[PDB]
Symmetry: D3
């Protein structure tokens, strides 16, 4: 019960602060959908290119799944940083 | 005219690819608004706390404007990485 | 009351999980002290070098306060990522 | 012999500077232990959850091993940046 | 035709701006070669160390392929950021 | 004398390893020059735009000096990571 009071640095949050935090998480949900849509686009692009050696090589050289994972990590850690600016923990 | 053909690594893009790139940029616009709203919340929070030394010190120790700038940078570079997974340049 | 239940994705945490999260925050406190000690070392190094144009230029070219801020940000976001691996939110 | 004199930008370091660098590396060792402890906690949590499809899915959706690797990388590169602020190389 | 005019935020670029962007991409090509050379050095180092358990363990503990991938990602995203400072998109 | 032997995790380096490390630092020097050239381009672009309110606003909204600093940091930390893959310290 009231587990945030047991975690160091965590302060009591107003409803306004919880509302802004939830708004960030929700916009992130739409990014999750977009990233899923991009990942589906990549699978189909790779699928359509089977036995086109030159296009398979181009895709593999561009490394789009790796760049999609990089972008996902940046979106999530950016979310975390925005939520930190709102929630403002009392610890390093 | 057709400046993308003069830039190394840039390939011709389909309308589908341009549409997905534009979708990322649009979701980013909503993040820009959210970040602006958070920045306004911080100014008012700081303003309401003037001449409350303890609360001003708490805010300054939490560094929320710095965390908001960190989150903004991560959101923008994540966008850039997602768009790269879609546009797939032909260069390192 | 019980504000974590109002935030999206947050799940109930066991005492074991809260204990590990607190351990990360505590090791971070020691890093905060170390960073403070480094920052003090830099002020004194700069102070001792006043009116040694060549050494002031060397320090300014090395940009150590900027590198100290970079390292601090990486330590804090690494902490955040470790705590996320423990707390495991249910959201993107 | 004296290999640091063959590497560009490296300057001679005082014992005080070597001591501060070693202090960062030591605090990192404690983080390494903590990360190992978290990784063990994750293996056991996954192990205890075998044949609980819903809990296995929750863990896989939270991606905690990926977040633990992200946090480890941030801790190590933060260490590198702090040590750079101390050692102050003479190169870009 | 003229696909940059269909992408949000993209502005018309001068030849001077395209020239600077291409210069960044070219210096990146040399980094790509260097990274390839390092990767070859690692394969040979690992190869020469087969059935030297202690040296194989040392290499695996140092994780150099992981650090090489980290450095590659930083070089590429740094390139992207420099090119953004030149091309200056009109979007978040 | 032989200060690398006093720093934890540092191992003796072959001449081949020092040569590869120096090659990274040298390619970084060329990036430093490029970044300086970009920074000069930005000053002149801003200078030429004085008392063109709309173009000054466009430049300020694009934040190119901030993006140039982001790219510089990524180039330097990427260099650090590549050099780590070569030098392979024996510490976390
Ligand atoms: N005004 C203006 N700005 C432009 C134009 N083209 C690019 N920019 C800007 O430069 C940034 C970096 O470009 P890049 O060389 O890294 O290539 C990009 C990048 O890898 C990835 C994400 O792009 P974005 O997040 O929009 O960042 C771009 C922008 O800020 O997609 C790559 N990419 C971009 N365009 C293409 C393309 N036509 N084909 C393949 N890959 C592409 C410009 O015209 N105007
Ligand atoms: N004062 C105060 N601050 C709070 C409270 N709850 C969170 N914060 C702050 O927001 C940061 C980001 O939160 P998040 O939505 O990203 O969720 C976190 C994060 O993914 C990961 C690491 O947390 P931390 O490094 O402490 O950063 C947190 C903090 O600065 O753990 C996630 N997480 C946090 N709490 C929970 C939970 N109860 N269940 C699951 N995951 C959690 C707060 O109450 N007060
Ligand atoms: N003036 C001066 N500066 C020095 C000296 N030694 C190191 N520095 C500076 O500290 C930074 C961080 O060092 P590190 O403890 O993280 O170890 C480095 C790092 O992991 C990786 C990349 O190094 P670099 O990008 O040059 O950053 C180094 C530099 O700015 O290589 C590791 N590494 C460095 N030297 C060795 C070694 N001899 N053996 C094994 N690994 C090494 C110094 O003497 N003078």
């Amino acid at each position: 019960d009231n587990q945030h009071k047991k975690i160091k640095g965590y302060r009591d949050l107003s409803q306004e602060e919880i509302d802004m935090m939830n708004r960030v998480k929700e916009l992130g949900s739409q990014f999750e959908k977009l990233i899923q849509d991009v990942s589906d686009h990549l699978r189909g692009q790779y699928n359509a290119s089977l036995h086109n050696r030159d296009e398979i090589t181009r895709i593999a050289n561009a490394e789009p799944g790796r760049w999609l994972a990089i972008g996902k990590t940046d979106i999530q850690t950016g979310m975390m940083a925005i939520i930190r600016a709102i929630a403002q923990p009392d610890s390093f």
